[PDB]
Each structure stands twice: as C-alpha cells, then as structure tokens.
Write a protein that binds this DNA or RNA. Structure first.
Ligand SMILES: [Mg+2]
Ligand SMILES: [Mg+2]
Length: 177
RNA sequence: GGAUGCGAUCAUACCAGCACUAACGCACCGGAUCCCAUCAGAACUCCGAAGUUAAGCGUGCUUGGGCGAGAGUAGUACUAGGAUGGGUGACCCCCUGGGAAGUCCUCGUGUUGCAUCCC
C-alpha cells in the first residue's frame, strides 16, 4: 500500500533563550509526499504565522498518521484556500475514499484539472470525516443509496496483459451491458 | 546628602510652567582712587562686605513637549540565490536564506573622575 500524499504531525518550538526558558510548542497536521517536505512546509507556516524561523527554531517530533480503517468507505470534507491567476479564494470540497490520503490526492488532481492550480498554490485549512447525512455536495450524496444499481456504461476493451496483444483480429469486439 | 573649582560622556543631561533648600559655599550685592572700559562702571576691570536668599546655581512635580529604551508594526515592506514557475502583459505564487521604518502602547528623565569645603 503506497500513497503519494502522507499526513504528518510536526511538532516544533522556538529555540529556548534567557527570556523564554520554555517557549510555546506548536503542532501542525500537514500533507506532503515525504517527511522532509512536511518539515519544510511546517517551518514555512511557523515563520509566516508565528515569526519563528527554522534557523532559530527547534524540531521536536514528526509522526505519520494512517487511516484507522482503510477497509471501509468514508466521506471526507476539505476546506482549502488556493491562488488563481487573479487572486486568492476559499474552497470547500467533498470526496469519498477509503483513506483521507486518497481524498487529498483526489483534491489535488481535481484542483489541477478544474482550476489549473498547481500543488504549491494550495493550502489545506481543514480536513474532517463527514457523516453521510451531513454531506453538502450532490456528487457524494448520489452514492448514499442502500440499493445502488447502475450498468457499466463505459468499459475499455483490452487483453489481460500485453502478452496476448495482437495487431490484427479476425472479428470486431463484441460488447454489451 | 550635597556645594564649589577643573572636567568625561555631550538632552535619560534640553525647553516650558509651578514648589522647596540646614551649614559652608556659589551668588546676588556696595563703590569707581588706582589698573582697565565703554554713548552708557550696563558689560569689562579694580577695590570691597552694608544688605538678601528676591534671582541665578541645586532639588522636586506636571495623566506637559522633546529625548532614550522596550513592545508592536511584522516575518509585513524590501532583498541574495532557483525554476523548460503562473500570466498576453503588467506583475505575481512557490523553494533555499536575510530582514526593515511611521502610527498606537508601556517605561525612564542622567551617570560619573580629581581636588577643597559643609553636613
Ligand atoms: Mg532662589
Ligand atoms: Mg512626555
């Protein structure tokens, strides 16, 4: 099981000094492809929001967060702010996936596809597991059906592997739903 | 705890308005023959000790001005380096780093060297 995006809890503080023997300890929940990039973004946010630089700061702890039950489907809501070609905007989106990592990957892909927003232009404000009744988007609410039933409208025809691939076939494919 | 003479730093020491000061001092102060000096014994110079702490000098107060320190402004403005980064462009996001200044708020209003003297 490999996820492109991982969730980390990064803990850090400003370097102790004479004035502050025990400086405030700050924690963040961040998304990054690696722990190194997670720490980089943690220090970026600490510098921008608390005036604590990496040079005069201390790294305390970093742990990965894994989905409790990756075997079941959940509804995930993501509150984010992104930058467009003309300014900044806030955005709330909903996704269905077995893990929040998959939901975040879907969020990045959808932002790229629909708004041409690159990964570095997106800040995640909040994440949460939404119950079915509290979902706001029709896209997620359409699969909240006890008896869900539909045919496979679009299926791509291919051999099990390229071993059986042939340029020529005697008959055209026979497709039906 | 001060004053005076000579200073160091050269406003936390400056400016303005009020109040106060034992002693020695420092002063104000009395004269113009002499040295000296002017329109003017005002100033400067010389000779004094009648009177006064009225002023100067010193100290204290002002929700005072200024001055000095901090907080904040603000990881903002700006900026060194990177990108086959976004954008038509103007410009701008992001990565590796550095990082200010008014307004507003709080505090403080000198510290000292040598010598003589009073207490
Ligand atoms: Mg007097
Ligand atoms: Mg003042």
């Amino acid at each position: 099981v490999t996820y492109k995006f991982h969730q980390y809890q990064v803990v850090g503080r400003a370097l102790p000094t004479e004035n502050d023997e025990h400086p405030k300890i700050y924690r963040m929940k961040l998304w990054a492809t690696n722990e190194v990039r997670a720490k980089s973004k943690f220090w970026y946010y600490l510098r921008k929001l608390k005036k604590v630089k990496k040079s005069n700061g201390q790294m305390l702890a970093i742990n990965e967060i894994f989905e409790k039950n990756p075997t079941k489907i959940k509804n995930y809501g993501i509150w984010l702010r992104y930058q467009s070609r003309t300014g900044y905007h806030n955005m709330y989106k909903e996704y269905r996936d077995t893990t929040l990592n998959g939901a975040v990957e879907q969020m990045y892909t959808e932002m790229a596809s629909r708004h041409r927003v690159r990964h570095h232009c997106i800040q995640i404000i909040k994440t949460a597991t939404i119950p079915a009744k509290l979902c706001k988007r029709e896209s997620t609410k359409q699969f909240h059906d006890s008896k869900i039933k539909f045919p496979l409208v679009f299926k791509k025809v291919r051999p099990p592997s390229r071993k059986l691939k042939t340029t020529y076939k005697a008959t055209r494919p026979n497709l039906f739903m």
